[PDB]
Amino acid sequence: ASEALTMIVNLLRSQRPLQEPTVEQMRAGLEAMAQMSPLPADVELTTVDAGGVPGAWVRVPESDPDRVVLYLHGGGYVIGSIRTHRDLAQRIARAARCRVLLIDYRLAPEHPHPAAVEDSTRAYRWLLETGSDPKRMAIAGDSAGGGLTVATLVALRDAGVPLPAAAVCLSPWVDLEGPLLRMASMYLAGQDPRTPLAAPLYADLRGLPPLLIQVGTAETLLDDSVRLAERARAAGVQVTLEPWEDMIHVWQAFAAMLPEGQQAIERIGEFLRQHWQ
Template structure:
């Protein structure tokens, strides 16, 4: 990789009937129940100058907790101007059985691979507009077309409204002729939590599942019970422990441990292959590590990438080298599975 050095790397092995074998596609092990050891990437390298400039810009915090919901949304929408789309990204609006969506395609691409991307924003802000640029960069890296839903937001539409919208989009894609083996669910922060929660909802209903799932700094615990969500134990300029808990109360006031709202509490056996990327400065670091460990214990194929010194969803900033390399690894993961 051109960004960072992989100091700790546990290559994936396959444990079958108590014995460990190499992950060989030709092995007879693939005829039996498979349990995967987690692929762990701990990226130990000094953050880039570009990343540190972004972190410094936000070092005083975003101050969103002092704003009304309407002001928070306006702030986030205004930030979209920082991330213009590249000229060869084609945007087509559509209606997915009542859910407004964008199709993002790279001009000239003929791929049938679909990545459903769910934007972040603490379940109460963000939109297709705020995340088109990031979703388009992932589309390019994964050689995929992206479906970007405008799911309903809390507090006007609390849980399970957003999950229902994601599931509606999933079913719509199947009626449009796409197969589950062509479709990836992905998202950042709250959107990462929605990708995990929607997959659990589909699994619970016995429906076809996405071929794989990608969570960028995913939100899996609405109560902020993890060690990095304790006050003073993280250096996160983007989020605070109190903000995590307040947002959880707004999103799911009566269901903060429902597994579709807080995927950490889900039954994960049979979950699709999963990639999680997270930075060590994040309040949500322990949301990622705890979910990954639980998924591994359930026999899920998990790749967990922990980047030292990086802030929440650093992927948003296209000029940051760590964002560029992380997006490329997302693309490689998707192409390996789809």
């Protein structure tokens, strides 16, 4: 609805994806677009070994150090890094007044399912080991990271690990079968595309903590979020589904230039601070 949206949409077209790019071109591409994004000078970054998963603490002046979001970046389980999602991480840290742990979870096709879930559960387990309180923790992720957020909560529940206070899905990708089909292939490596921890639309969602789903009405993954909300609510999960009118896929990533992007992130901050008390 804002004019900034039309400017974002034109920019995404202007980066014409005509030739089908290799995985390496896609990684280097996304890594370059992210280095052009300025990181505010009050953002403190600390690299860490999160129990055998490489990670980075994102901290800002107003971060409460006892509140933690484990943030799982999207990129079709193929693309993305601790560098590509630092701006989203630093904005969630401000709005939610918390530390964010970004993790460099193993990517396909080099490391197929269930490697991503093994890394996300391990990093969560490591936060507990090192003194983080589940009632002051959340898991959040965008697109593939949004599906991995759900897969992680299921895998943790099934292993008897204490679940966090809340979770946040930004335009989650939870149905691997329906561009993203090829990234689905690379993640699955022959496995059934309704594998519960790969496609958590088929997972048992009972006992998950309060779940915020932010999705745009102008995105092909609208139905993933709607079906997720239905399955979660049928399983007795406290779901908040926010469909944002006319918003595109992970519009929150454009928060620097899109008022709806910064508004969505302030809402993420509110949801988290509400469930932390």
